[model samples]
Target chain A: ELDPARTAIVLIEYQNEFTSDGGVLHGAVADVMQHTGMLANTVAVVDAARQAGVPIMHAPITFAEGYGELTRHPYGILKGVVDGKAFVKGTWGAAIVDELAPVNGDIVIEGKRGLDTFASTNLDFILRSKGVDTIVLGGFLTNCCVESTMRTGYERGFRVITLTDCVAATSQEEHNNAISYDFPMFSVPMTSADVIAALE
Target chain B: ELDPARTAIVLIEYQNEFTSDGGVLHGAVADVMQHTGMLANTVAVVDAARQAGVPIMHAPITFAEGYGELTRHPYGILKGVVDGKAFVKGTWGAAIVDELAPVNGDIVIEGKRGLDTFASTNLDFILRSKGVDTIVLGGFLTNCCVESTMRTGYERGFRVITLTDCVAATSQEEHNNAISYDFPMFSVPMTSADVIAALE
Candidate 1:
């Protein structure tokens, strides 16, 4: 059972740049987004979490001008983010999607340049300060950010749970491969309803 | 190119229980080990790395008696570890394999409670102390421990490299998915030969 007092919902990179139609990296994951229907499911679950008074932490990754925080030649998916100019600081695209906007108490984590939310951010500190022992993760890039956070959370001794219907990726193949091949090993592969049911 | 002076070869979970034919959990990944020629390749690479003056760090995961350091009930792949009583301290099975044993000046990292080598150990501190900026990973369970270390190493700003031929998994599909899809995103996937060729 998940105690709302000790559990947090960590939302990763729900920015317009990654979820909106006109945004830079949205088209890359559009097919998987449509297929998974992640947006609606996440909204539903996060709403339930908020209703149950679960602390929510939104981790939207953004880089400043010239991507100075990153290495000169950022490769792999990071190169994709930089090349597309997605999630640049001071840009509208970097803002969280309106549906999942940070309300009164939601924490907008800072300094997230790489996949892991806790790496450069004060996330672990906040989580520890809040006395949180469990983290339920939902967000963009199921195979990347979500998986990365799961690994860290697991290693950090948190009860890591990945919301299965609340994440998307660049392709179905990539998304399914992670969920099938990886998530179970590090996290309790769960649905949004499972989270709501436990909390409610 | 991999700079030997700045690079550290971090070996994860090379215990006798995981690597030896007669040891527990060996059957699970033995096929991939043989197919990928991981043992031979790892031996070759590490010998070359040591001879070339690159630092080597052996990170073996061993649980104290009665598994007090871990959870009461481990699930998924970890359940197998608990069930088989593998990697327990003061046991031969938990000892690093003789072939890749820590030679002179090689660091043997302690306190690897889970899959990630960096989480419970001072591996990062030691790495930084030695002026290491890059990590070359090889070990048992390609998709699990090796991938976990790679993800953390990447987030920590290290140039992560997974020795492709020096890593094995429980199955070919498991091994292939990590190398083909995930390694590129988190690390540069290179063979033992490629690393050797790039060495000093």
Candidate 2:
């Protein structure tokens, strides 16, 4: 059972770059987003969470022009991010998508330059100060950033819940694999409806 | 190229409970261990790392009687740990296996009460104190603790490497899945021999 006051929702990188077409990194994730219908589900879930009085924290990744925040020689996902010129700070692509735009009460987490949200950000401190014990995560790169955050949250003693229908990846295979194999180990994997119902 | 002085091999949960026969958790992981031939590969890698003068850190998880460190209601992997009654402190099951036991000059990481070694431990402080920037990981539960640590290391800006054949899980499918898909995203997935050759 979830107490809305003790549970927070963390939305990771639901930015134009990953969530909208014409965005640099959008092509890589569009297929998975379509497959999961994550954007619409996320919109619905975020609205429901707000109504339930669940604190919403948005974690979006951005870098200075020319990718100054990252290593010069990057590999793996960061390499993909750099090569595609995605999420450049001050660009429209770095902005969170309009559907789930933050209101007055929502927190836009700063310093998320890497996969794990807690590593460089004040996410943990904010959650602790808010007296939150459970975190519901929804975001981009299901097997990468989201999984990274889930693992860290679990290790840090938070009850982690991954919203299954509210996450997307570069590929459906990767998305399903993480949801099926990885999420259950590190989190309580649930659908948007399940989470919304529980919020009640 | 890996600079030995700047690289450290952090071994996770190479305990008797996961590695040896008759240990509680061994039965679940033994098949995957055999399939991967992880023990022999890990031993060879540790020997080569020692010869190359790279620092070694052992991260083992242990619990006080009745799991005083964990929540009263645990789920996921830690629940598996408690249900299996494995890794109780001062028990043979919790001991590091003889083959990979910590020796002189090796750092034994304390306070690994959870999956991610960096969490609940001074692993990052020790690594930074020694000016180490790269971490090579090998251990039990390929897709769990090892992946968890790899993500943290990557986020913290370490050039992380995962020893493909030096890690095992409850199933060969999981081990292969994490190595083939997840490791490449978060860390350089390499074999023990590959790491040794890179050292040279």
Candidate 3:
């Protein structure tokens, strides 16, 4: 059994880079977001979790003036972000999406410049201070950020739930493989509807 | 500077199934091991670490009768292991290789069935009891068990070093990629020669 009061909803990189109509890489994610009403479903889940007293936290990856803080030659999924110019700081593309913006009561954590949100970030401290025992994760690129965070959360001894519908990858195969296979190893894979019902 | 006295060399897998001449997936890993001289390098480093009073622990992945202890449908790397009939308990393929055998005075820790070594394992307790504050890792499949243990070591607050030349994977590309890019983000990446020099 889960207690919503001891849980946190961690939304990772739900930015224009992956979510907005006017953003690069938008079409790729937008295609999947449409199939499942991803934004709406995530919004509903977030609302329900909030009402149920679950903590809501957002982790958006951003870079300094010239990505100086980041590796000069980034690799892996980070290479895609840098090559696409996706999450440059001070740009609309880097900002968290308006649809699922962090409200005044929500904790907007920062410094997720790497694949794992807890690396070089205040996430562990915040989660510890809040006494968060379970983490419900949703965000862009299911195989990357979400998986990385899930690995870290598991290492940190947090019960993890990864929302299947709310996480989008460049391809359906990648998304589905992550959800059906990899995600389950680190998290309890649930659809947004399942998450909402749990919250309710 | 790394203190060899407080360090332990962690060898994961390196069994016949993953490394020897008589196993299923042996060719893939053996090819990379040959190219990198991984076995020789790892042996040299382990010998030096042992001579320097560093704790040496061998963690092998084994399954019970029928793998009943594992989840019904194991996923990720374990899925491949079960499908390939690799690392089965009480089998020749499951035995650790001769070159990396734990000598007298070395510890042989068990329970490495899961992705994270700390989960469902006595590794954390053993390390703590041994007063090991720094861990140097060398093993099979650079991106799987090696990386998983490194992440767990990081979370457990132990200083970790991955011996790049001492670990092999099915592909040279993945082996190199994990050591050069992935492992560094969490643990310090060093070659066997570097670790040997530290021990000296």
Query: TM-score of the second chain in each model?
Result: 0.96, 0.98, 0.94
True contacts kept of each: 0.53, 0.78, 0.04
What is the Å distance of residue A19 in model 2 from its true position? 0.9
Instruction: Write the residue-wise lDDT of candidate 3 on B1-200 in tens digits.
Output: 66766788888887888778887778878878899888889889888887887888888888875777765665445566677776788998888888877788888877777666666578899889878888888887776667767765765567788888888877776666556545765677888888888888
Q: Which structure is stronger by TM-score: 2 or 3?
A: 2
Alpha-carbon lDDT of model 3: 0.78
Q: Give the RMSD in angstroms, all C-alphas superposed, for model 2.
A: 1.3
User: Candidates ranked by DockQ, best first?
Assistant: 2, 1, 3
Candidate 2 falls in which docking quality class?
Answer: medium
Which candidate leads in DockQ?
Answer: 2
Candidate 2 chain B: worst-modelled 10 consecutive residues by lDDT: B172-181
Runs in model 2 deviating more than 4 A are none
Top candidate when judged by lDDT against the true structure: 2
By lDDT, the better pick of 1 and 2 is 2
Chain A TM-score, each candidate: 0.97, 0.97, 0.94
Q: After superposition, how far is residue B152 of candidate 1 from its true place, in Å?
A: 1.0
Off by over 4 Å in 3: A1-10, A13-98, A102-137, A140-145, A152-200
Worst ten-residue run, lDDT, model 3 chain B?
A: B70-79
Q: TM-score of each candidate?
A: 0.96, 0.97, 0.64
Compute the lDDT of residue B166 as modeled in candidate 2: 94
Q: Identify the superior model by TM-score, candidate 1 or candidate 3.
A: 1
Candidate 3 per-residue lDDT over residues A1-200, each given as its tens digit: 56976899999888988899889879888777777577887898898987888888999988886777766855345556677787888999988899887787898888777767887579999999988888999987776667778876765667788888888876676566557645655677888888888788
